[PDB]
Symmetry: C3
Subunit: 514 residues, 3 copies
């Protein structure tokens, strides 16, 4: 029940050679440099190689779990939108940043880095004309359209802290998150289209804003064009506001520990992520866990309202300068072959889905996946919950045709990027196992009965992290006490994931879950 | 009718050697490095040599005409007030930044770089106390007084976007521009003195502010000292506010593409927006090369600071170069039609930059006012604003330069930022009424309006277009980017539309027919 | 009556070697480099060696007395809180930043650099949540508790100009200072404890704020825990607000000439100090005048509401990365041996007091100091007024046991740091004499009758400074005309101290005073 890296992950058949490989020893050799007291040099070199800095940093890391003063590269200044848009636009403006798969397949198209950069700059200029300053919160209530990315980056361009809310959340949840983030600006659509169904996003927005006094400006994207109520003064059309603005906006120089965004967990708790550490973590996980290469076309099927959508739809892939996919539909619309039709049409090199979608597709039958070419795929990703051996085997056999590496990535919103996953070109996978910790992750197992670390293999308990990592959450927005109580107080000296986990005789990690 | 550069432009008679010369081939050699796909090295070298940067840039240029996302040196940070005041103050504080020629000739005096920097810092501190932030618009309604420059630079010191309004504008024009820029602070004077005449500037300001709700603070310069109405709380005297402030203010670190200023074109007036680094570089380079400016030179542009000529070649260009500039408060015919030449003789001006209207008026005023003046310190005579007739050109050459000064016919607009087509004085043989050759970074062409295609070769006529962006090009129209694109970019896709008909003769010289 | 540097200041008996010594010639050699037209190299080297800069400076100095446009290192950017907390926290987090001697001796404890940094960052986050921006004034009405050092530095961390008011000032003085600085945020305690006595700081604050319209937020430190009135909305508890905030805050990159703080002289006149020049001056005076070394324990017993508390309790010692003492009590509480009990308990290496406290202790009798060890002491400092020969001799004989160098430091709030003092390891002292000018100080004596500088030795007149020094006051807050009239108009070309002074035949300076 062991699956070595496939030939597509061995650099054969014209496929790119893996970044780390070919076996477990190479992963160990590289991972030893990323943890421990001598790991500062590796992290400094990676931060300078991966991200573009306006000012260089001096200190690599500081702080800890006990007080929630975690710092990474504090003296450096950078911009997330510069690292995700501007440098790649300068290198190659015509390269596709986003493959936008609309709800209707005929409406899908490619958005270049130039178009995405121009839209981001227009939205950033609109936000600046609204009075949005560095450190201000901007709520984003958007469906899975490509402009959402622009919206995100727009905030990241001006130093605003964006707070994304799942589209289709009720008026109460949206109101709670908007009130907690204390935003004065909300970005939303008139309506959303998903699975051939209409989401009345603007009606929900009006119902929620009836109880959100601090919101003064609403920017409304005309996604569908159907009639929606628009309050005079408060509501403005995205296209009309952006037509008045120039297609370029200067980047605000952010400290490394400036909060990049707030993401509310589904009182809602707002996990806060800073700029440089989170960006470095997601870029490195995208490059290594999925073996991304410059010409790759990443296809993550999550939602931008989720942490997976934050990391491996927007920030991670665009920081790497590769093509990412924004999928506006459901896996069974119009037909349960939608994922595979999309992969064949766009020649996706990686696929990142959730076990729930895989299970639904498996329940939908084999005729929808059996006759598809695929074969541009190299890495198949799973995230969100433990994947059963049957679902794992269906994913391997039909979506990858036994020629793609299957990565079971375990992480949370508070970890920022992937924590435990197999390296596709090095690690032999076990079905339903998140195998080994990522770079900078020193995870162990504590016995909850005694609170002591269970050394060795073939043990079971609660999963903890020994040391902070660059992409860890820094606080809970205006609720640092809750942050410390949830993640740092249960086991002092360790970060508490809250997931029961086991390590088998081979050292492989098995996440039991919450 | 060809005029080679005179001996004063040949480095002889103790005059400085020209930066570019002595003939057309040298101009071509330097210009070829400033255009095309291999010109990034030249522009990066010039940007690093001419301007002082707080942070270095990585990219030289990006963007284009189609969407209006033009970028020059985007990653670099700098300050216009630092590059126009502080570095020259550090090098030589006692050097004259401004020769202020007052309306009354006995009231004229030299303002040093130290005094100008201190005044700029006091006004910047006042504006900061008013709550003005980086990116905020500040309206300026000032006559041709030297403190106006300070006011300009004051905004540029704190990241404020200044919006200059010509002091001759009525209450309605001032109100329209002030409302469009959405400023909360207006810098103005009690009264102006031009041609012995009084401009009731504060009265017009009150009439306009009756319909300008967003303006909360008015800073009033006591220019004449006559009684004017002063609203309690809203209006404060410039001297009283500046006395409470320190004489130094820190320079705010500004991105290259941060908007330096808004200038409204004379239905709704269009606010042409200029960024900082590209515009500063363009104006400094045009000032150094088109007028052959040298460190000890005394530049005399007699335009108004309410127009782009005053923005570029009274304030930003000459002060970025660290030379003496002139602020002329009077008219060409006050007190007598010899005022220009009396000024040039008294201050030993090395360059003159006027408009064909003033030269035509002086020519109609008779030769008795110019024939008996020395004027030998002059080396370059500049004309800007409209095509200059051969008779006016010859009167300018023979009477003002005494046939010993180069005549530059500089063609450009507010949207170009700096001079686009002009003769290089030490290299180009001029033809009267001709803006001869494009400046560095300008790749101009003639397009047939009926067909829309570029008319290659010589002896062609059509509309003037620019193939590629240049550092000092306007970035947008304030809150009206659609108007910017429609006016300058959609008429001929892939090109920048000047709106001016132009012809190129057999020698390659450009002739601007005009709008 | 001449006193050569003692063996404790000669590098003997295991004591650190003095930075400058052993005689007057060495002081002259080092001081000649710090004044004159060729002193820019020395000051540039010292600025780059002493302070951590975000951006390097190009110009060393500019401006002058006549217009009050003094500039030092204008193009450089830095942060005072970074230089006082972050770099030392990065080098050694567990080192004691503050020895907090509480009013009750049993309540005293050591605050480490990590704890001080975390408290400063929490307060900075609270202030940022109050809307405090760079350049905004924040009033501080705090007793001699260690958190005051945090509050100060919190402002310095975010570019806020802190304005400290002596605790125990009446409601009218507090109101005048708060109204003049135009602050919108006030930091104070519920009550203060000094000399076993209670100071109703919150009651005075309420009485003052009844006439301070611009104040919108009050942060109240629960120093004693006794019941005080708290206005709903306006007043919030320090601990409650700080518990919601993360323990790290990014440092605002500040221009060198950005105003660090406003200190009102006891209409109140707010002396304004910029960041880089003041920080450099205080750090250099602390290092050289007191011969501070990395492991030293500086004990300045002034008040943080005074300029001495600004320079040699908070900024100077913490910039040097050494331990500083925050003394909450009086010299005679609970007994007149409190100073010497504290010195013996914490092994203070330097003591910096005022002549009034020394005279009070001398009046209290010799039985309180005669039996104390006091061996760790090396330097004894006096500041505030001319110290009588009898008081000087008592200080030398009983507090130092004729084994400590006695430095008489003359300076004002407008000089920022010490102007005239003996270098302890080099200068032979005379009782009641501030001997020689400090680095960058070129003082002279002007005859007030004629206004001309009196050349040579054995002259008397008014003390003037020929050239600006880095730590000189830049202005009086919104009263620059008063600043010029007080300090620069009486003798054009010079800085007027306002103190009559004499120089004897040996070149020693004798300050007559106001
Ligand atoms: C990235 C989503 O972050 P969140 O939406 O905050 O959910 C985080 C929570 O999902 C669960 N989980 C995620 N990935 C896996 C996995 N590979 N195997 C098992 N369980 C998993 C786990 O319980 C975790 O703590
Ligand atoms: C600098 C003033 O800028 P503006 O006030 O925006 O006027 C810009 C408009 O003036 C005209 N013009 C300016 N210089 C010349 C010239 N040398 N020869 C011919 N015509 C000229 C032209 O029509 C242009 O388009
Ligand atoms: C640091 C206190 O600054 P301030 O509270 O502003 O008082 C400043 C004023 O105290 C006096 N003074 C301070 N130190 C001494 C000293 N060593 N010898 C004599 N007189 C001194 C002097 O009159 C000065 O001008």
């Amino acid at each position: 029940d062991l699956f070595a890296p496939p030939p597509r992950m061995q650099g054969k058949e014209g496929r790119p050679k893996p970044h780390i490989g070919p076996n477990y020893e190479s992963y160990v050799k590289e991972w030893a440099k990323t943890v421990g007291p001598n790991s500062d040099e590796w992290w400094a070199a990676k931060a300078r190689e991966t991200l573009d800095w306006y000012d260089d940093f001096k200190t690599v890391r500081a702080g800890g779990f006990e007080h929630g003063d975690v710092q990474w590269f504090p003296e450096g200044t950078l911009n997330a939108a510069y690292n995700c848009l501007d440098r790649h636009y300068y290198k190659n403006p015509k390269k596709t940043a986003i493959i936008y798969e609309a709800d209707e397949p005929s409406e899908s198209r490619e958005v270049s880095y130039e178009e995405l950069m121009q839209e981001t700059c227009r939205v950033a200029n609109v936000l600046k004309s609204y009075g949005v300053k560095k450190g201000d919160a901007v709520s984003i209530y958007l469906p899975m359209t490509w402009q959402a990315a622009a919206a995100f980056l727009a905030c990241a361009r001006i130093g605003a802290i964006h707070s994304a809310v799942f589209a289709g959340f009720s008026a109460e949840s949206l109101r709670d998150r908007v009130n907690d983030c204390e935003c004065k600006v909300l970005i939303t659509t008139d309506e959303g289209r998903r699975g051939g169904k209409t989401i009345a996003t603007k009606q929900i927005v009006d119902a929620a804003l009836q109880q959100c006094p601090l919101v003064e400006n609403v920017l409304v994207l005309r996604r569908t064009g159907n009639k929606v109520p628009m309050t005079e003064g408060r509501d403005k059309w995205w296209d009309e506001e952006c037509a008045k603005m120039p297609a370029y906006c200067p980047c605000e120089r952010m400290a490394s520990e400036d909060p990049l965004f707030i993401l509310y967990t589904s009182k809602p708790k707002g996990v806060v992520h800073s700029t440089a550490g989170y960006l470095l973590g997601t870029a490195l996980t995208l490059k290594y866990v999925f073996d991304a290469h410059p010409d790759d076309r990443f296809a993550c099927m999550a939602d931008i309202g989720w942490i997976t959508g934050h990391s491996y739809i927007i920030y991670g892939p665009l920081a790497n300068g590769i093509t990412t996919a924004v999928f506006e539909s459901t896996p069974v619309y119009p037909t349960p072959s939608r994922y595979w039709d999309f992969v064949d049409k766009w020649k996706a090199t990686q696929l990142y889905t959730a076990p729930t979608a895989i299970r639904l597709l498996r329940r939908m039958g084999e005729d929808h996946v059996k006759n598809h070419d695929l074969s541009s795929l190299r890495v198949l990703g799973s995230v969100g919950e433990p994947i059963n051996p049957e679902a794992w085997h269906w994913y391997n056999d039909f979506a990858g045709k036994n020629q793609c590496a299957i990565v079971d990535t375990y992480w949370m919103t508070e970890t920022g990027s992937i924590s435990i996953a197999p390296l596709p070109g090095a690690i032999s996978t076990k079905p339903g196992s998140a195998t080994f910790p990522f770079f900078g992750m020193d995870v162990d197992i504590i016995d909850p009965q005694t609170g002591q670390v269970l050394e060795g293999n073939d043990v079971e308990g609660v999963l903890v992290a020994r040391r902070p990592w660059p992409s860890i959450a820094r606080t809970v927005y205006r609720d640092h006490k809750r942050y410390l109580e949830t993640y740092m107080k249960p086991y002092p000296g360790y970060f508490f994931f809250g997931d029961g986990a086991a390590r088998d005789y081979d050292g492989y990690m098995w996440i039991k879950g919450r």
